Amino acid sequence: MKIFSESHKTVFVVDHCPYMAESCRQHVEFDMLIIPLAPISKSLWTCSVESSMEYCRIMYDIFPFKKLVNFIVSDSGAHVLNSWTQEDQNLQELMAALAAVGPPNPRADPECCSILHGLVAAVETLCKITEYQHEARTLLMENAERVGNRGRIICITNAKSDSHVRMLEDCVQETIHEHNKLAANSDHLMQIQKCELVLIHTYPVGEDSLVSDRSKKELSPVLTSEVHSVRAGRHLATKLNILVQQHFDLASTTITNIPMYDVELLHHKDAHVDFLETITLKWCTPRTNNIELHYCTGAYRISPVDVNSRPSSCLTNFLLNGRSVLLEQPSKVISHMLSSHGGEIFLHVLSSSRSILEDPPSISEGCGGRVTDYRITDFGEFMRENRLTPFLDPRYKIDGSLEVPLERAKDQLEKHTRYWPMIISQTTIFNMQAVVPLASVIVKESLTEEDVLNCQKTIYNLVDMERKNDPLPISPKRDEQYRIMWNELETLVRAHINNSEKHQRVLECLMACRSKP
Amino acid sequence: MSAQGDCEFLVQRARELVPQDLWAAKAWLITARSLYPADFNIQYEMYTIERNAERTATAGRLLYDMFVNFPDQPVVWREISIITSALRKQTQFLRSLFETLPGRVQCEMLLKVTEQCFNTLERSEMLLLLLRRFPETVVQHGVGLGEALLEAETIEEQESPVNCFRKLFVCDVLPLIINNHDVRLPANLLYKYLNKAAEFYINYVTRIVDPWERLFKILNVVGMRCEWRSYGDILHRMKDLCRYMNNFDSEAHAKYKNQVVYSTMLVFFKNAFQYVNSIQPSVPLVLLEDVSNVYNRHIVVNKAELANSTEVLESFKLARESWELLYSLEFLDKEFTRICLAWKTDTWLWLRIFLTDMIIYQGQYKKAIASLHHLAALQTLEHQRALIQLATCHFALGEYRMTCEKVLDLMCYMVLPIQDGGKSQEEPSKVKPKFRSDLKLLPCTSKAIMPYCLHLMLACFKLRAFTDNRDDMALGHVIVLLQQEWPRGENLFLKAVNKICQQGNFQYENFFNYVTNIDMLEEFAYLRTQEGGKIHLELLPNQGMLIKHHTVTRGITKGVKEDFRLAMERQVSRCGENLMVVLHRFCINEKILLLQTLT
């Protein structure tokens, strides 16, 4: 929907009790190439943290902006590991925070604490306002009430029984009610309108599931209990993967036929509206410079699911090297094309269906199409001169006036076209090579002293050519041609008189040097 | 010289001075009276002269003097007769003259005049005069006057009980005699008194200030005589006495039994007039069934058609209990039947009409048909009531044959609606009865009857055609009669189409003469296109012998296919019109349609 949806705020929490420290009975075979060591199994906490981190990596890869996420380990203390500002919602900082957290203590105090502190901290943290929420509130003045603060809390823990599940369900409902009541009176704390909750449970494989799966249940109009349950290891990673696909209406793609295996990409679902659970597209022969400006109806970022695997590494490296990739959907029709715009692989969506703007009227029969003397090359030069460039340094114009560079571009555009004849035969001053430096330099905002010297030299040899009676371009006697080009030049310089006092100076010099009858 | 000559001379001398000197004439008359106090002529002269002066006290004095002293003079009797006629500016002057006379002398003169009168009617007239002016004369002459009036009326051999004598007897004599607490009367003469009174009102109110209230007061009067408010609470009260009355009785029980018979009769008739005055005031109303669901009873009356609907319903319901009580008790049943036969005659019309609505309300129908025959015999708008109530009782529960016969006859004579009633006048209310389609009370106009008549025929044909098979003119008649009041016929018509889809042999031969509805025409041609049962539709006069009498040729199939679509386009062109007019036109034309209803 809008920017502030139920997926805007994701508040991860993680179990940190000593109960979540035993291995998951899924020992790996990281020994490939004597007598190898005993196979090693990741701990429950490690598996949960790893799967959460994969979720967040996909989060950040597809949605760099306008989607934040917290991290609240649930230990004897309640620690929030990163804040809501975009400068702190980063992957490496989260890595650092988890590293500083340290492995769970095996025999410190098992029954001293549970994950209720994590849930109460999450509902406490969720009620705050993001930078985007604050900006929207400030922008919409005196009516900043239609901005929902809906979020979502996710929990990974090893629950003892379903009675415990109902217990912390009642606890979270009570604490969200209390938080809403507290935030009603306060000002710098929003009231949660919808806090969807997920209470995933993990267990080592080979052990019975003490908690059965429970469907969606709304204990309150501000809470949606969706407690799941799955084993640790690969199952938990797959569960968080389908979670991240479901939460943000993502989609999958299965690019195959790669010259050298298949590769999978995750992106926004809107890329698949043309086809209308993984679509399978084929790499097609990439032509170097067949066409340059495609008709892309959507640019959706992608994120590999196996970013450290050989096929995905090869594909992403080739894309980042600069060349695009033209996929095709399953006689053939051209379809989605990959691209790499600075290091953010996009999945553009072309339009293979018939264009409703087919067989456009000929430009040779429209108004003005029967003229073959257009200054197309000169306008090409004009386009090249007035090209755009990004400005990362905002300067001040006069006094506290932070000029918008777009307005500067518009003003330069207006200045360059104060006298721009459309057809070659219309003008004579522009067609002559003598006044070309003067034409190029006079349109600038402020001519320098070297510019003054150049314009003086230009008028000098213009008068020299007048004296020599050289054949000017036809564009009706020689004197008539001279007087008309002088009139054109004086008209051009007159319109730029207000640009600077140097323009007035050169106009006065021209008037003094003019051979007026 | 005889004194008569002197008296005549004195009177003549007094008479001559009247135009010149009234006082001198009076002095001469006074002197003549002093000389001859026993002379009647002089006293009459003073009386006439003073009457020419319009005086009251002296006129009364002289009149009393001559009446007492000279009662044999015809002039005095003529003067008294003139005075009595005035009692029945000069009228007021003579009224004042009678007032000055003493009350006893006035009573004596009135009695003398009554004795001298020969005509019985006039004699009773000043008998009632003296009766009202002197209430002390009620005891001696009140009973005699009424008895003589009754005997004279009987002697006159009045074929009709309504006559002037009975009118005076009821209106004047009875209040005077029964308002007195001296005359003692038996417990039987009261029965004849109210019986005569009961005949007075019903003859007058069916065909004067307020007879109904006056006679109900008489019922109160005959109430205390036998012992010696709204009209609703009474029946419950007498009903409670019945719970004490029809129980143990020993010798007569004359008091309670007679009261619960006669009094119940009066309230029943009072309610009877109330009910038949609101409905059928002379637009009149008629009582029917509903049948409305073609797709302990209570009467459904529209408030718009009758502003006073609530009170009329209660009077009818309260009358029903009165008639039920008057027939429930075996002892009361026999006497009431005897009482009615005495003075019910041919039930007149108001009771006869009221009787019929009782039958249809109770549940019995055969007596309603028999009663309906009587109404027709006793008897324009009028024929609607007999026919429309005959139709619903014929419908009953399981006839379905005579009902369609009667309504078709009513259809033939009911054709006013050149414009019907507009387009839509307050489309039927969404009030849903608690699983009740019950007795309605509609006006005698086409606005309410027209949907009802087609409601009846649709109900009869719906049961006739939806069972068994072969979809004969039965089903075709349902389709035509389902045209009315769209879209309430949606489901039932779709059921008919489904049956038509099953058999595929529909044949009406008049489909394109009655069904001017686009929602039905459009649906029907859907069959002929995709897979429908090639409905026959011999919708062209003289087509059977065209197929039969002509040798099989291949140049006819194109025409057989084309005409159905062409005539369907023709029927489309009609559309519009007035739905009731087209439906009625089918009704009158297809009077042989009743052959199917015999099923």
Partner: protein
């Protein structure tokens, strides 16, 4: 009484009269309290004589009216009125008569009911010679001096009916129609006609209210004006054609006929009035001694009036006289026999009604 006279000699005439009137009031009240019948002494008479201009006379009359209205006891009122106005056979009677006439005229003017009833009581016990003079003065004052003043005498009907009856009796006794100047005034004819016709009992209230214990003294006024009214009705036409205005004559004739009829009716009800009082056939309000002079003067007028020229007038007068006699003798008011009636009517002219009355 010497001390009272001495004390009052130092006061003015009006003041002296006022205090001597008060002294007579208290003295007569004490006398009546002591004895039922008080004897009138010469002391009060002389005190009134020597104690009781136009302004002074008017002030004295107003003081007398105020004194009479203030006191409420009737016996003292009547006794003091009599002592003030009863003739004593002296030269001061004329002044007393003038003062009484002025007082009665003022009382009629201002409706002084006690003064009116005092005058009626005194006039009842007064010789007719003074009564006729008082009536003459009242008639002048209310009929001839100030026109329209008879309406003031109109209102006396509802105030003192006994005074009305006495005034009628006095004017009938005075205006005996024996001369042209003695003919009753036309306004007075209307006046008495309205008085009698408004209330027929007016001329009989005196007879009813007076306890009859002895015969009236000779020379005094009659109990009822019936004799005077009968005489007026009888000889009134005779004087009218003796004086020979047609409209006034017709109005007077109608008035006299109506008055005669009302007198006959009054006699008719007086028959009853004598009936309940047990005076029927014993007491006669119309004395026999009064019909002889009226018959004689009727005969004199008839002889003087040339009956060949006034046959109708004589016939009408004789008819009226015969009717009056018949009603009087039939009602018991005239205790007489038919032989006596025949004897007195022998000299009267022939008249069929008169002969019938004589025969009976």
């Amino acid at each position: 009484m010497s001390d009272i006279r001495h004390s009052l000699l130092r006061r003015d005439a009006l003041s002296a009269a006022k205090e001597v009137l008060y002294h007579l009031d208290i003295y007569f009240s004490s006398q009546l309290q002591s004895a039922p019948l008080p004897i009138v002494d010469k002391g009060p008479v002389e005190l009134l004589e020597e104690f009781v201009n136009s302004l002074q006379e008017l002030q004295l009359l107003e003081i007398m009216c105020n004194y009479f209205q203030e006191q409420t006891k009737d016996s003292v009122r009547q006794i003091i009125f009599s002592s003030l106005f009863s003739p004593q056979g002296n030269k001061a009677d004329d002044s007393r008569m003038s003062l009484l006439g002025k007082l009665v005229s003022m009382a009629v003017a201002v409706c002084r009911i006690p003064v009116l009833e005092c005058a009626a009581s005194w006039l009842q016990r007064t010789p007719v010679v003074y009564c006729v003079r008082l009536a003459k003065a009242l008639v002048d004052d209310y009929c001839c001096l100030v026109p329209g003043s008879i309406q003031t005498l109109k209102q006396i009907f509802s105030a003192s009916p006994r005074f009305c009856c006495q005034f009628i009796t006095s004017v009938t006794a005075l205006y005996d129609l024996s001369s042209d100047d003695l003919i009753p005034p036309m306004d007075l004819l209307e006046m008495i006609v309205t008085w009698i016709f408004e209330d027929p009992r007016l001329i009989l209230i005196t007879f009813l209210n007076t306890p009859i214990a002895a015969n009236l003294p000779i020379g005094f006024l009659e109990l009822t004006p019936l004799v005077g009214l009968i005489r007026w009705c009888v000889k009134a036409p005779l004087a009218y054609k003796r004086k020979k205005g047609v409209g006034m004559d017709r109005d007077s004739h109608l008035l006299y006929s109506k008055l005669h009829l009302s007198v006959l009716q009054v006699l008719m009800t007086l028959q009853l009035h004598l009936t309940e009082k047990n005076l029927y056939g014993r007491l006669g309000l119309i004395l026999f001694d009064h019909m002889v002079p009226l018959v004689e003067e009727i005969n004199r007028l008839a002889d003087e009036l040339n009956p060949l020229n006034a046959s109708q007038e004589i016939e009408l007068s004789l008819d009226r006289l015969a009717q009056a006699l018949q009603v009087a003798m039939a009602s018991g008011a005239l205790l007489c026999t038919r032989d006596d009636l025949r004897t007195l009517c022998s000299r009267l002219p022939h008249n069929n009604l008169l002969q019938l009355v004589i025969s009976g």
